[PDB]
């Protein structure tokens, strides 16, 4: 092992001097003589056998001339079935207070993406049990998914519902990466995973633990952590999933909360690393740093990784560089809106901004494609009539336009549904709606069969039959 000396300290940026045998970039360095473990990741070579590194933990307590040891390799995270049922940090250390990870292997979080020759697979359809998603923005089994939205629109709830409706039924493994989210959310997720069998902790009389089963692995880089950790925790989780993809060959599920935080972390240090800022304060190495991540998330001829990324959109501005760049990296897209959530329509998915590569007549049949496109046409027509209604009124609209407005309102209210995890907000029970039922109901509503039925009936109903039951109840209570 080499030996170096800390030269200066500026926030989360640390310059280090070596007498000989400089380490390559991305290598990991360990500070010696500190309270807790402190790892640094090489980022730049400056000259005079000097390097510039990014600290994973706080630099408080560091001293110039303090000693540093090169490990000869980048941050190696443990992998295997031993990480399952267990929480891990950015540097692989556990933070679950259950013991160390007895892994027989370690992978470097920094790897090269699979080449073009390693093609994808067929666009397999993924059934989530959600209506608007399965109808208008079908999710692919082997492709990337995006959940765009600001603050207070239902990203975390939707990911939790997807976990309840997919991860439990999934025969492969699954991974979660908390990238700059709230820690309370992590505690809640861990408890819910221990509850629903996705994690199986069994304490022993000798003080050890047993996580047998427990088809899930958790990684956390939350807001309390500094930059350097929030950035690399995503690569950590992605390597943990790449192990199961390449070697085991099992299908894997990756959930990321939020990816935007990862980009923000880079900006927090770029100006300290001597870079000139980009347009709105972001770093120059935005698109590349994000693509080097995203290209590692892809299906190959050995396995498949289905990812679900929640993308914070600050100030509800989709023109921001981070989501603007992320849009191009996704197979399926789902944009959540505040104007819809104000109407109590949860999930607050905007069906006119959500898209999907899979929505084509050759993949999903024409009964699905034409139904979705008719729904979208109806909603756009209702959106174009908004100003005429606001100025003149409903009196001016013809009966065709009134029928259009009625059907569009019914569709809007019908795409809503209650989740199982939102019981603690609404109190109502959860529903799992299969896709043929959704298509039947949408065809029925668009054909004009349900014009007689009241608009209120189509609220938080899994199926059209439930809507009929609610209408019957409301009519009976009317007299």
């Amino acid at each position: 092992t080499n030996h170096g000396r800390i030269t200066q300290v500026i926030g989360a940026v640390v310059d280090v001097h070596f007498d000989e045998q400089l380490p390559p970039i991305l290598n990991s360095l360990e500070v010696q003589g500190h309270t807790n473990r402190l790892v640094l990741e090489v980022a730049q070579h400056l000259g005079e056998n000097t390097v510039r590194t990014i600290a994973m933990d706080a630099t408080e307590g560091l001293v110039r001339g303090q000693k540093v040891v090169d490990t000869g390799a980048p941050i190696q995270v443990p992998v295997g079935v031993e990480t399952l049922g267990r929480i891990m940090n950015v540097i692989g250390e556990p933070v679950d207070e259950c013991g160390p990870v007895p892994a027989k292997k370690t992978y470097s979080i920094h790897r090269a993406a699979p080449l073009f020759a390693d093609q994808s697979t067929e666009p397999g359809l993924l059934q989530t049990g959600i209506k608007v998603v399965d109808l208008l923005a079908p999710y692919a089994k082997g492709g990337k998914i995006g959940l765009f939205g600001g603050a207070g629109v239902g990203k975390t709830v939707l990911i939790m519902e997807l976990i309840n409706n997919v991860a439990n039924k999934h025969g492969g493994f699954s991974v979660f990466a908390g990238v700059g989210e709230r820690t309370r959310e992590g505690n809640d997720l861990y408890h819910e995973m221990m509850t629903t069998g996705v994690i199986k902790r069994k304490k022993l009389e000798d003080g050890k633990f047993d996580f047998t089963g427990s088809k899930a692995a958790l990684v956390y880089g939350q807001m309390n952590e500094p930059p350097g950790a929030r950035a690399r925790v995503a690569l950590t989780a992605l390597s943990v999933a790449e192990y199961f993809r390449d070697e085991q060959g099992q299908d894997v599920l990756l959930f990321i909360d939020n990816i935007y935080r990862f980009t923000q972390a880079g900006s927090e240090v770029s100006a300290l690393l001597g870079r000139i800022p980009s347009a709105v304060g972001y770093q120059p190495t935005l698109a590349t740093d994000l693509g080097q991540l995203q290209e590692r998330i892809t299906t190959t001829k050995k396995g498949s990784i289905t990812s679900v990324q929640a993308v914070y959109v600050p100030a509800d501005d989709l023109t921001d560089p981070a989501p603007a760049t992320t849009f191009a990296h996704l197979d399926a897209t789902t944009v959540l809106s505040r104007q819809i959530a104000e109407l109590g329509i949860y999930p607050a998915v905007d069906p006119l901004d959500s898209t999907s590569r899979m929505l084509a007549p050759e993949i999903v049949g024409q009964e699905h494609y034409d139904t979705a496109r008719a729904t979208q046409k109806l909603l756009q027509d209702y959106k174009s009539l908004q100003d005429i209604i606001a100025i003149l009124g409903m009196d001016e609209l013809s009966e065709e336009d009134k029928l259009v407005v009625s059907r569009a309102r019914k569709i809007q209210r019908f795409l809503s549904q209650p989740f199982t995890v939102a019981e603690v907000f609404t109190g109502k029970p959860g529903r799992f709606v299969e896709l043929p039922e959704t298509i039947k109901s949408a065809q029925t509503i668009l054909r004009g069969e349900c014009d007689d039925l009241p608009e209120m009936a189509f609220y938080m109903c899994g199926g059209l039959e439930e809507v009929r039951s609610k209408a019957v109840k409301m009519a009976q209570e009317a007299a």
Binding site: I10, A58, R184, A271, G344
Partner: protein, 487 residues
């Protein structure tokens, strides 16, 4: 070791020496002034001074104490006003506290935590009903200038004296900490006077980093307050900490970073503002039964300009909090005081931080207010409406006139329950809106005169059985009989 000053300017020094300095430790000059080392460059060292720079003279000797910047903690702070570093400014005695605590610390992890289930009684009606707050929560109070933010926080502080006086169990008492960043000493003195006038200082302390005080004190004061509250959090005693305004802290940090020649970012701020506020607010938590079971609630305050929450600091602090209490000037002048916009204001915790007795009423109230907000604009124009729509308008107007409150006039939870019961079951629809402001007051006095048992039962059982329901209905009937209003 020792060093010598090489450059001095604008409350910042550049030293030569002290090769064994810890980044973030205290430093002492030869005139009593103190400093904090931040930029451990190669040749020199960048120190920020805790006071004026007239004392430093470019050649003065400087010495490191070895202590990381820390503050005292304990019950010796209760009833006292102190600066960012724990030095008192009340002018009456020193701080009797033996144990200290580091300012910048690692927040508690995922395992030693639990869900939020206990409420934090704010004293207001709209907050405690429609935007509930828990113990272990981090809820922002964001608005424009002169809208009623400090008033909300001070009412939250004042409502606790009854709850604390009627017990000697520290597990149930709620202590309070008011951090004043950027304020002027006249305002802090007015707040201290308002609290002393109501005996609301024997359970509070204040941390005043005012405007004349240098930037580093404004930057460190909230972390000092969190350190003082972590004593309660880890000892099993609940505490609530209020930051007034956090944005002022961000401005101070920008000043320090720009004078240390660090490069700026958006709006001349650094990139580390998010880390600054995340470091600060993630220390609020609800610990488990193994770690004592304590809590540290946070109620930060933010002043927006022209209601622009699309700005840089509001966006961050909105994205790292468990709620929002928006405040508007239009509603403030229309007559709604507190000016809480119940549409934008939310609380992710929600009913879990609410009593069942308040759940039963507040669900219906939220639904009715949503409907009223939806048809309020149409109603103003004036068109024929169905009886149901008119009823909705009448009930929404009644509830809106109910949620109004005087300043420094908070209320207990049971009284809120009773009043909102009167409002929800239809005992205010025919009544004149402008009359309700006394229907409330009189009704309160009535149920504090002759129906103390109902209040005691609601306080103990924390629910509304059918017996209490019928008793309350009978009381309301007697009250309406004994009195007369314009309708």
């Amino acid at each position: 070791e020792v060093g010598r000053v090489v450059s001095v300017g604008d409350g910042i020094a550049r030293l030569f020496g002290l090769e064994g300095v810890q980044a973030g430790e205290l430093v002492e000059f030869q005139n009593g002034m103190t400093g904090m080392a931040l930029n451990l460059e190669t040749d020199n060292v960048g120190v920020v001074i805790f006071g004026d720079d007239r004392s430093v003279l470019e050649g003065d000797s400087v010495k490191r104490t070895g202590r990381i910047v820390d503050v005292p903690i304990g019950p010796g702070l209760l009833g006292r006003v102190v600066d960012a570093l724990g030095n008192p400014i009340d002018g009456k005695g020193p701080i009797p506290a033996k144990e200290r605590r580091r300012v910048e610390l690692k927040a508690p992890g995922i395992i030693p935590r639990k869900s939020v289930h206990e409420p934090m009684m704010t004293g207001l009606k709209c907050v405690d009903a429609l935007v509930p707050v828990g113990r272990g929560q981090r809820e922002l109070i964001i608005g424009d200038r002169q809208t009623g933010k400090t008033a909300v926080a001070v009412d939250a502080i004042i409502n606790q004296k009854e709850i604390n006086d009627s017990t000697d169990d520290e597990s149930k008492k709620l202590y309070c900490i008011y951090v004043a960043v950027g304020q002027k000493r006249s305002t802090v003195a007015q707040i201290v006077k308002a609290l002393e006038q109501r005996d609301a200082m024997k359970y509070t302390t204040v941390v005043a980093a005012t405007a004349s005080e240098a930037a580093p004190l404004q930057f460190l004061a909230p972390y000092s307050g969190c350190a003082m509250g972590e004593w309660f959090r880890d000892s099993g005693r609940h505490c609530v900490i209020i930051y007034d305004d956090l944005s002022k802290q961000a401005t101070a940090y920008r000043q320090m970073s720009l004078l240390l020649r660090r490069p700026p970012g958006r709006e001349a701020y650094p990139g580390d503002v998010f880390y600054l506020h995340s470091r600060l607010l993630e220390r609020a938590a609800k610990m488990g039964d193994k770690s004592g079971g304590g809590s540290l609630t946070a109620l930060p305050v933010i002043e927006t300009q022209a209601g622009d929450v699309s700005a840089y600091i509001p966006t961050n602090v909105i994205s790292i909090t468990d709620g929002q209490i928006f405040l508007e000037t239009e509603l403030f002048y229309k007559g709604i005081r507190p000016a809480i916009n119940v549409g934008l204001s939310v609380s992710r915790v929600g009913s879990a931080a609410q009593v069942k007795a308040m759940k039963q009423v507040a669900g219906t109230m939220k639904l009715e207010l949503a409907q009223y907000r939806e048809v309020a604009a149409f109603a103003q124009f004036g068109s024929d409406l169905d009886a149901s729509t008119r009823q909705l308008l009448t009930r929404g107007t009644a509830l809106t006139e109910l949620l109004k409150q005087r300043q420094y006039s908070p209320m207990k939870n049971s009284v809120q329950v009773c009043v909102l019961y009167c409002g929800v079951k239809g005992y205010l629809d025919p009544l004149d809106p402008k009359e309700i402001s006394r229907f409330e007051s009189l009704f309160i006095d009535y149920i504090n005169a002759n129906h103390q048992d109902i209040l005691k039962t609601i306080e103990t059982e924390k629910e509304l059985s059918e017996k209490t329901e019928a008793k309350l209905r009978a009381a309301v009937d007697e009250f309406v009989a004994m009195n007369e209003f314009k309708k």
